[PDB]
Amino acid sequence: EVETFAFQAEIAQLMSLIINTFYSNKEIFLRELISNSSDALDKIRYESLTDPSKLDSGKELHINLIPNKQDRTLTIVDTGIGMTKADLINNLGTIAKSGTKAFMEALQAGADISMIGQFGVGFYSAYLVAEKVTVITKHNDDEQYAWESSAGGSFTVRTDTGEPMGRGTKVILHLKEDQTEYLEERRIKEIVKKHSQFIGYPITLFVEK
Numbered sequence: 429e430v431e432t433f434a435f436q437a438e439i440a441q442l443m444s445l446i447i448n449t450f451y452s453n454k455e456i457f458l459r460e461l462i463s464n465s466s467d468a469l470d471k472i473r474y475e476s477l478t479d480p481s482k483l484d485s486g487k488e489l490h491i492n493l494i495p496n497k498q499d500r501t502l503t504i505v506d507t508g509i510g511m512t513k514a515d516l517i518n519n520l521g522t523i524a525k526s527g528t529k530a531f532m533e534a535l536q537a538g539a540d541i542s543m544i545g546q547f548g549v550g551f552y553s554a555y556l557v558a559e560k561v562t563v564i565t566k567h568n569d570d571e572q573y574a575w576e577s578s579a580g581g582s583f584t585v586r587t588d589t590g591e592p593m594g595r596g597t598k599v600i601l602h603l604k605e606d607q608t609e610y611l612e613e614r615r616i617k618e619i620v621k622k623h624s625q626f627i628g629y630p631i632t633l634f635v636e637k
C-alpha cells in the first residue's frame with residue numbers, strides 16, 4: 429500500500445536549503461504554487477482544444493484556496509492536467525536536478541530564494557511554510573495518488589482512497605506552528621493581489637465557519 433522513496437541527493441539539498449536558510453520573504457510560496465496550478469491548467473486547456481473529451485473529467489478550469497485553522501492546513505486545489513504516478517515520483521513533473529543546479533549557482537551569484545520559480549522548482553518553496561506537504565493528484569491517464577513528504581530525505585506515494593478529485597492537483601500545506609498567518613483571509617488576499625494578480629483562471633478563497 430505505501431511506497432517510500434529517497435529524494436535524489438540534489439533535491440534533498442534543495443529542500444534543506446529552503447528549510448534551513450534565514451529568509452524572511454516566505455509569502456512567495458503561494459505565488460509559486462499558484463503559478464504551477466496555472467501552468468497545469470494551461471496544459472489541459474491546450475490538450476482540450478483538439479480533444480474536448482479531455483474535459484470529460486471536469487470542464488471548469490480554476491484554483492481554490494482553502495484554509496482550515498482546525499487542521500492548520502492551507503490547501504491549493506486546481507483542476508489542471510494532474511500528474512501520473514511516474515511524474516509524481518519524478519519530482520512532481522519538474523526537471524528538478526538541473527533546476528536545482530542552476531538555482532544554487534544563482535544564489536552563489538547573488539540571487540535570492542524568491543527567484544526559485546525561475547529555475548523550475550517552485551513547488552519546493554512550500555517548505556518555507558509547511559512542515560509536511562501532501563499532494564493528491566489525478567491525471568486522465570491514471571488513478572488518484574497521494575504523495576507526501578516532511579522532508580528528511582524521503583517521500584511516500586500511495587493510491588488515494590480519499591475524496592475523488594475528477595482531475596487536477598491538490599497541495600495540502602500542513603503549516604509550521606509559527607506560519608499560521610497564511611490561514612488568515614486578509615493575509616491570503618493580500619498575497620494573491622500582490623503576486624498573482626494576472627493569473628488567467630479564477631482563484632476562489634474559501635472562508636471558514
Ligand SMILES: CN(C(=O)c1ccc(O)cc1O)c1ccc(C(N)=O)cc1
Nearest residue numbers: 461464465467468508510511520521597
Ligand atoms: C502537472 N503539474 C501539476 O499537476 C501540479 C504540480 C504542482 C502544483 O503545485 C500544482 C500542480 O497542478 C505540474 C507540474 C509541474 C509544473 C511546473 N510549473 O513546473 C506545473 C504543474
Ligand SMILES: [Cl-]
Nearest residue numbers: 523524525526
Ligand atoms: Cl533535470
